[PDB]
From a paper:
Moreover, solitary PMCA2 structures obtained from an NPTN-free environment in both the ion-bound E1-Ca-ATP state and the ion-free E2P state were indistinguishable from PMCA2 co-assembled with NPTN. In line with our structural findings, these results indicate that NPTN does not directly impact the transport activity of PMCA2. For a better understanding of the PMCA Ca2+ transport mechanism, we analysed Ca2+ binding in the E1-Ca and E1-Ca-ATP structures. We identified only one binding site formed by the backbones of residues V407, V408 and V410 and the side chains of residues E412, N869 and D873. This binding site is equivalent to site II of the two Ca2+-binding sites of SERCA.
Plasma membrane Ca2+-ATPases (PMCAs) have a crucial role in this process by extruding Ca2+ against a steep concentration gradient from the cytosol to the extracellular space. The structures revealed an overall classical P-type ATPase architecture with ten transmembrane helices characteristic of the P2 subgroup.
Numbering used by the authors: 27 to 124, 149 to 183, 193 to 288, 339 to 1042
Write the structure that this text describes.
Amino acid sequence: TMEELRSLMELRGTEAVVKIKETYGDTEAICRRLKTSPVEGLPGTAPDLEKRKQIFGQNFIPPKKPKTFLQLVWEALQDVTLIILEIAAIISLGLSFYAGWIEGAAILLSVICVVLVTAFNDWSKEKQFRGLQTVVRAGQVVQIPVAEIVVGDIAQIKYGDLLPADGLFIQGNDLKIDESSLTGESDQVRKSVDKDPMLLSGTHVMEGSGRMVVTAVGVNSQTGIIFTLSVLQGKLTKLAVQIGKAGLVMSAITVIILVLYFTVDTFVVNKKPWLTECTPVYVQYFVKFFIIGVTVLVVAVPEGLPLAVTISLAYSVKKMMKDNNLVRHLDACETMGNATAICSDKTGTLTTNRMTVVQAYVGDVHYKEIPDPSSINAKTLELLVNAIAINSAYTTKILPPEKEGALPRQVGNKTECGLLGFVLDLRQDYEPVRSQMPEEKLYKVYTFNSVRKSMSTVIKMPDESFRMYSKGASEIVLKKCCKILSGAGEARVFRPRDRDEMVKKVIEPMACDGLRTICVAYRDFPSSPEPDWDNENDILNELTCICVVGIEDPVRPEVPEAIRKCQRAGITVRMVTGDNINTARAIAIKCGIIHPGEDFLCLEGKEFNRRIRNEKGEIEQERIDKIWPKLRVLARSSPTDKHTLVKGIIDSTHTEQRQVVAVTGDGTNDGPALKKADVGFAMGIAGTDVAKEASDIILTDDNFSSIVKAVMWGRNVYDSISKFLQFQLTVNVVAVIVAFTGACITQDSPLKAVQMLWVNLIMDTFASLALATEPPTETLLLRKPYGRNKPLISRTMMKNILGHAVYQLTLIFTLLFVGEKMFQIDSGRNAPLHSPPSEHYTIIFNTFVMMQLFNEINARKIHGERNVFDGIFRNPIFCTIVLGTFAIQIVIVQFGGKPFSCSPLQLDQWMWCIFIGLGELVWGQVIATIPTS
Ligand SMILES: Nc1ncnc2c1ncn2[C@@H]1O[C@H](COP(=O)(O)OP(=O)(O)NP(=O)(O)O)[C@@H](O)[C@H]1O
Ligand SMILES: [Ca+2]
Ligand SMILES: [Mg+2]
């Protein structure tokens, strides 16, 4: 019974419609089973619906968890670089047992630090995105959070509302719903009691409005049937595989050279006969060679790059959440860095959406300020307030602020609220006028819509008389009026010459001042000759204009600076609005989108469609290629005309560089365009669920300036990866060269296995955390957007890599060769197998570590910036990582002995190594001078 009725709604056809007429009557026939408050409202008692809904079931129930922590660690364990590292560790541990174990431990100490942290991110972010994600419940004032939905509710459906649950249609006007989410057909189904009262969860309402109780709301319906049953990343992966291949080749060459050298020396040259008892010692040498190659591989493989990308993305998202940006698609964090065009709507985003009356043309006299009630003649003020109050639709009201004496809140549409505010400013009150006729004697109402741009109201209160007010848009209604009420209640004939003269004199200044012109009129019908209200053309004419009002929405305080920043950073801003061309241009001038004197083009939607379409109804992109390069303002735009623009920009090949666009579209009809744009923002506070569902990033404060932040952070992400590539790529060069030289000369590979693994831990794992959490700077907004074919390794990065590599190689080789004479500390070269560690090689290892540590500090400036120490303390992880590494290096060198192949060093050598380390900063300052070109 609780789910039996669902079978009916499964029919989806005329069979379902005839089923209710067979035995189920209507909705009211079976609603008797429960209370359901048919024509009344729920009292709101706490234990109310326990009796009706004996078993309580909510669709709010989510899945338990997509993954657990153990599963997340297992998932993160499967990466190519990590597979190579694990194989190398297994081989090292296997060969050692035949302190040889410690080397393997080092590798594992990397792998864990790579997986766990990553898993933690995938455990936290996945939670937060789940955490982020007033209801359709209707009554007297009943508005409750969206997360319960129960059977028997009275849902009021408006245009653009997303249906939260299935139901049956009671009453309404022209409800058209898109059911492509469940049927796959994008045709607008028209819902009615007689033909198709079925409503489905997840469908989007396109047109009309109405009411709904319930068909069967729950997961047992078709909703639960399904439930129960990156360019940057690719380039980084390609770079990683290239580096891995190069490292493998170098390791193979080094191993071959060492093995061949030893074999030629021991057998061919010395003529030593091979003896079986020497077989054990021999293989020891071989093992000591083989592990070296493995270590080189572990050095060359860039295991820290995926970690750096993950950390940068996660940190950027978590800090963007502070800047009023909710990120639903992670990749959209990066793409917004390369945005080169921003298409935005006027109302809401650029304007505060609070409309107040500033200018009026009452009594045939223009007033730039709201006039005193004494100045306006009698019998005109009363007519004006009556007309405004009656046309205010009786739902809009100026509610008292009640919050520290703030501005009064506006509930309904902004134009009627502005007119009501004008009435209040005239020291008149509309409440008694509304109470006199609270829809009691309201004869006929012409509902406002975007086509007519007006609304008419018929009052039969006068004795056997009809009065129609019919406020308009000052361009449709104004030309229809045939008389004008001016002076002391004098009605004079309005002629077309007077029409054009008053237009030019009065209407144009408001439009050029950024205001929107609204006309108020009224007309009286004789006694009762005929109710010829069937035709609208012959009834909406012969009006008498009372006054003309200019309504303005103030521009946001911070959007001019944001637009200036956007235009400075190479991003062009275009505005799409439904206002007339004059007001749109005047507002865009104040916003700074279009400069006063330029060749920018602003045209209406009608001529847009006419010009971009060559003969016949087809639309050609070749025509669109001419309009979009210099189209700044679009006025009287249709809901679809934005989409036609966005596509025209994205699929354009005439421009040498490709275009990445961001559309700040909010609204139900903005669904297609929002999906076409590379990054689609949606307004948060006033955004319908339809627009927010298909959005990439959500702006909580619905402000344009926050979009600028979405630029900066995005670019920051790129830079972070770049600087990591500046550090790792030099170290794995120098070491790979040094060891290779140690293969050709001294046959020793100066840096042992454990020391090279310590360097690997320094440069791969810890460096990702160190250089992947850099806070962003505003200077990132001072460069042109980066192309999508730009090389990952810029020219300055390679210059720095080569200069620092040259310095490091020179110092290391000079030390390795002449340190016996320089430090008078004896020679460590050509040391025999199983020999005590020498101080000469410990000096080399310590100097190498110190130079890498200072290269980490001086490698934070990719763009040739001289002041390296700029903003170090703004990052609290970099300093602690560097200092901890320094302390660990000290304790390893001093206390660590045979296992790490390091001997205690006196203070003099330590100070000289630190001075050589400071030499790295000196050399960086020197190399900053040399021009790149
Ligand atoms: N309550 C109203 N009664 C009569 N005319 C109205 C009313 N509200 C607005 N208008 C006029 O009719 C038009 C309807 O368009 P509307 O979508 O309300 O605003 P817009 O500014 O044109 N477009 P947009 O910027 O997207 O909000 C307005 O531009 C006014 O000229
Ligand atoms: Ca490595
Ligand atoms: Mg519109």
